[PDB]
C-alpha cells in the first residue's frame, strides 16, 4: 500500500532529456540514458519509466537503445512513446518490459486501443495527457475513463500537461477526480518538485493512486531517489 515510485527516462536522438509541457524542442539534456537507468537501480528504483521521444514525435525511434536500457534492468519497466500499430507495439513488448502506455497516438485509433487491451491485458496501461480535462491532440477526460473502463483497462497515467516539467508541483485536484472517476489504478505524472510534494501524491494511495513518475526533480537534484525513497516508505 505504499506509493510506487517510477524515476523516468526519456530518450531524444540517444539522450536522456527532460521536456516542459512535453513539447518538442524544450529538451533539456543529461547524458546518457543507460547510465540514469542504472543509476535509479542502484538508488533503489522498483520502476524504471522508459519513454521513446523520438517514436512519440515520429522523428525515428531509439528501439535498440530502449531495448537495450529494458534488457538491463532487473527492475520493472513501463514502456511509452509513440505505441500506436501493431508493430510499434510488438517491437516495445519484444523488449521484455513490464508494461507498456498506450498514449495520445494510440488514442487516435481507439478501437485497436480496445483490441489491445483485450489481448495484452495488464501489460497495457492508458496514457492520458492533460489541459485541464481535455485530452492532448482530444477528448473529455471523464468520456475516456468510461470507455476505456469498459473496454477493460488495466490502468491510466495520467499526466498534468501544464505542470509537467515546471517544478511546480502536482495537480493533486486531477489526480483525485480520476480516482473519482474510475475504480482502476492511476499512476500519477508531471510536476513534481520536493519530498513534501511525493508526500502529498502517497496521501492519495487510498483514493486510487498506486504510483507516481518523477522526471525532472531527479535530475534537477531536489532531491535524491533514496531521499524519495523514504520519504513515500512505511
Not at 537501480?41 to 525511434?61: I, M, P
Not at 489481448?119 to 496514457?127: K, L
Not at 500537461?161 to 489504478?185: M, S, W
Request: aromatic share 4%; proline share 3%; hydrophobic share 45%.
Amino acid at each position: 500500500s505504499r506509493l510506487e515510485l517510477l524515476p523516468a527516462v526519456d530518450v531524444r536522438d540517444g539522450q536522456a532529456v527532460r521536456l516542459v509541457h512535453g513539447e518538442s524542442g524544450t529538451e533539456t539534456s543529461y547524458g546518457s540514458p543507460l547510465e540514469a537507468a542504472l543509476s535509479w537501480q542502484r538508488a533503489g528504483a522498483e520502476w524504471l519509466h522508459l519513454v521513446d521521444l523520438d517514436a512519440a514525435f515520429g522523428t525515428g525511434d531509439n528501439r535498440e537503445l530502449v531495448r537495450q536500457v529494458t534488457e538491463a534492468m532487473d527492475i520493472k519497466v513501463e514502456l511509452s512513446g509513440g505505441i500506436r500499430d501493431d508493430a510499434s507495439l510488438a517491437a516495445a513488448l519484444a523488449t521484455g518490459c513490464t508494461r507498456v502506455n498506450l498514449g495520445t497516438a494510440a488514442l487516435e485509433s481507439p478501437e485497436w486501443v480496445a483490441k489491445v487491451i483485450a489481448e495484452h491485458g495488464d501489460r497495457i496501461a492508458v496514457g492520458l495527457d492533460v489541459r485541464g480535462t481535455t485530452l492532448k491532440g482530444g477528448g473529455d477526460l471523464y468520456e475516456a475513463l468510461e470507455r476505456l473502463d469498459k473496454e477493460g483497462c488495466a490502468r491510466y497515467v495520467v499526466t498534468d500537461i501544464a505542470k509537467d516539467g515546471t517544478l511546480q508541483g502536482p495537480n493533486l485536484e486531477l489526480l483525485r477526480n480520476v480516482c473519482a472517476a474510475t475504480d482502476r489504478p492511476v499512476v500519477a505524472s508531471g510536476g513534481v518538485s520536493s519530498l513534501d510534494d511525493l508526500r502529498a501524491i502517497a496521501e492519495l494511495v487510498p483514493l486510487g493512486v498506486e504510483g507516481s513518475i518523477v522526471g525532472k526533480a531527479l535530475y534537477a537534484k531536489a532531491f535524491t531517489l533514496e531521499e524519495a525513497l523514504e520519504a513515500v516508505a512505511q
